[PDB]
Amino acid sequence: SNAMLLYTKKDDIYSDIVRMILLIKGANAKIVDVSKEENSKHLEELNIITPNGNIPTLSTDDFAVYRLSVIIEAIEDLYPFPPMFPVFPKQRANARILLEYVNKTFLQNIIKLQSPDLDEKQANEIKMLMQRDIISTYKKIVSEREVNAESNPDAQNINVLTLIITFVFYYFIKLKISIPTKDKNIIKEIKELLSEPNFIKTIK
């Protein structure tokens, strides 16, 4: 039944992302920090139900799913309320194409940066590649959210790509990476994003 166990690790950006989606839905979420020694018996379980100990994994008696697009849609299947995605199919496709870019360019790289055996030169090329786009990207996430909100004022849904870009920021701060802009307005907004209640409930 509803024995939803969400395997996560510490400082993993994907877990933190998922955990704030489960928080938004209301999901009965038995979180499991497989980073702690105590949960050694769960990590044993996880290397069985998934191929490579994939973190995060969202498991129940019925399934065990990994990958971030999968999980996010899974959550929307199990917890329709409130709506994570837009309603027009075109807008849904776009959110999906954007979410792919944010994952390849930022999430995936944020992870490569947590690798202890990383070359200090390579790690600096990553950190920079990120700065280079973080802004242009942010704009797109915005333009898109602006469209999906007006085209339906009665629907009132939560932009998942704004929720994610918020964690990209947190992890900039977290990796001493700098958000290259002097736009006092943009800055105003990035502060607001980190200032939202559900976000402060998560990282806490």
Partner: protein
């Protein structure tokens, strides 16, 4: 003339799209990139990524969203399971298909000129299917009551894999049966030719 699909020839990616577009019984033109102008090509898809799906106002060619978008654009008949626990699974399955299986096809498509490197790639693929022919018994179509995208992903695969030499026989069991009634469907049958 509502929506046109432009399709390069060899793509396994272009087959599985013409399948899903059939199951929807939606009147949509089908054009060949290789039967148009080097000028319009740059206008429908600048990055030259086929296949592309044009509408009055929209356009799309993202490999990962193209099909999922057809299933949402023209909603009936749904090409995802109805039961929630089966949908969540079927997604995580498409992902395996695209990311662990299609690569095996591209690889057999690129190192195709090297017979020493094919015979060995085939030996590892045929060897892997047969380590799964076990979890194929017990369903008309792939891991599901009815037709899913998983079947469009897999029709195009078997079909392009065939052309690259690799064929499927009675040696595969359930797979051969499944592969034979997959080819039976009117939607797969059309795009095949």
């Amino acid at each position: 003339a509502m929506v046109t699909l432009y399709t390069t020839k060899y793509c396994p990616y272009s087959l599985r799209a013409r399948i899903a577009l059939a199951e929807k019984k939606m009147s949509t033109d089908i054009v060949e990139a290789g039967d148009l102008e080097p000028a319009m090509i740059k206008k429908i898809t600048p990055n030259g990524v086929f296949p592309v799906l044009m509408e009055k106002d929209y356009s799309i060619n993202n490999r990962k969203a193209l099909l999922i978008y057809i299933d949402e654009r023209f909603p009936a008949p749904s090409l995802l399971p109805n039961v929630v626990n089966e949908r969540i699974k079927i997604r995580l399955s498409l992902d395996k298909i695209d990311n662990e299986w299609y690569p095996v096809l591209d690889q057999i498509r690129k190192h195709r000129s090297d017979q020493k490197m094919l015979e060995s790639m085939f030996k590892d693929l045929k060897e892997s299917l047969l380590a799964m022919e076990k979890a194929f018994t017990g369903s008309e179509f792939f891991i599901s009551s009815g037709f899913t995208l998983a079947d469009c992903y897999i029709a195009a695969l078997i079909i392009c894999l065939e052309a690259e030499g690799f064929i499927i026989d009675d040696e595969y069991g359930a797979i051969y049966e499944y592969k034979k009634r997959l080819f039976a469907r009117d939607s797969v049958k059309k795009a095949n030719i």
